[PDB]
Design a protein around this ligand. Structure first.
Ligand SMILES: *[C@@H]1O[C@H](CO)[C@@H](O[C@@H]2O[C@H](CO)[C@@H](O[C@@H]3O[C@H](CO[C@H]4O[C@H](CO)[C@@H](O)[C@H](O)[C@@H]4O)[C@@H](O)[C@H](O[C@H]4O[C@H](CO)[C@@H](O)[C@H](O)[C@@H]4O)[C@@H]3O)[C@H](O)[C@H]2NC(C)=O)[C@H](O)[C@H]1NC(C)=O
Ligand SMILES: *[C@@H]1O[C@H](CO)[C@@H](O[C@@H]2O[C@H](CO)[C@@H](O[C@@H]3O[C@H](CO[C@H]4O[C@H](CO)[C@@H](O)[C@H](O)[C@@H]4O)[C@@H](O)[C@H](O[C@H]4O[C@H](CO)[C@@H](O)[C@H](O)[C@@H]4O)[C@@H]3O)[C@H](O)[C@H]2NC(C)=O)[C@H](O)[C@H]1NC(C)=O
Ligand SMILES: *[C@H]1O[C@H](CO)[C@H](O)[C@H](O)[C@H]1NC(C)=O
Ligand SMILES: [Ca+2]
Ligand SMILES: [Ca+2]
Ligand SMILES: [Ca+2]
Ligand SMILES: [Ca+2]
Lengths: 71, 70
């Protein structure tokens, strides 16, 4: 469904629906501040970081250089 | 329904400019801290939000439901 495109979330199996649409804010930002964002422009609740699952399809959450600083 | 971009109301009071940022999809209640839950979770005596905004006293003070439930 078209309405699910560019809502912040992975809906295409390869998250293509987020991958090719504008920034969300004037300061050049793709996601609300209270969340974690991935290089394909999907963004997710913070606790998904390094939980063991590639939650945004680019897998930026599971790149360990993030949670080297998270207990 | 309030604060979701979809102008459900004709006069436009449904969507003010002082509206907080919406995290949840259309149809989902938004907790004050930004969490989401199904509408039936409101005032159900079970803390369904992290901070329990669905269980705030003011939200339940004059709660009502349809003719088929007691
Ligand atoms: C690009 O631009 C966006 C905004 O367009 C930035 O995101 C904002 O970042 C700021 C700073 O973190 C956020 O401001 C803070 O929000 C907290 C939460 O309140 C929000 O959510 C509630 C939910 O009920 C709403 O009611 C409310 O209106 C807000 O939307 C506040 O608690 C914070 O207040 C505290 O700090 C301030 C000082 O900053 C004090 O004055 C207060 O007393 C208090 O201590 C604060 O207001 C803002 O909410 C963010 N908005 C969004 C949409 O995310 C990005 O950070 C920015 N990104 C980049 C990379 O530049
Ligand atoms: C949806 O619901 C979930 C829970 O199911 C929320 O999770 C909480 O998120 C908040 C932040 O939004 C977390 O608060 C952080 O707590 C850190 C310390 O933890 C103690 O205090 C918290 C309560 O604040 C307790 O929950 C916890 O048990 C501990 O007692 C702080 O260090 C953090 O500070 C952050 O901001 C300051 C000020 O800018 C910075 O200096 C810090 O570096 C840091 O960035 C923060 O306050 C809280 O711990 C989470 N709780 C749980 C149980 O997960 C989600 O956030 C919510 N979804 C969204 C989108 O908001
Ligand atoms: C992203 O889109 C926003 C919409 O508010 C702004 O137009 C912003 O200038 C855009 N940034 C870029 C680099 O295109
Ligand atoms: Ca999407
Ligand atoms: Ca993850
Ligand atoms: Ca509305
Ligand atoms: Ca509840």
């Amino acid at each position: 469904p078209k309405a699910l495109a560019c809502d912040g979330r992975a809906d295409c199996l390869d998250a293509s629906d987020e991958s090719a649409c504008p920034t969300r804010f004037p300061n050049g930002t793709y996601c609300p501040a209270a969340m974690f964002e991935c290089k394909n422009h999907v963004c997710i609740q913070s606790f998904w970081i390094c939980d063991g699952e590639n939650d945004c399809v680019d897998g930026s959450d599971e790149e360990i250089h993030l949670c080297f600083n998270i207990p | 329904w309030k604060c979701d971009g979809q102008k459900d109301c004709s006069d436009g009071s449904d969507e003010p400019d002082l509206c907080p940022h919406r995290f949840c999809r259309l149809g989902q209640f938004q907790c004050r801290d930004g969490n989401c839950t199904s509408p039936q979770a409101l005032c159900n005596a079970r803390q369904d939000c992290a901070d329990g905004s669905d269980e705030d006293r003011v939200l339940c003070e004059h709660h009502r439901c349809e003719s088929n439930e007691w």
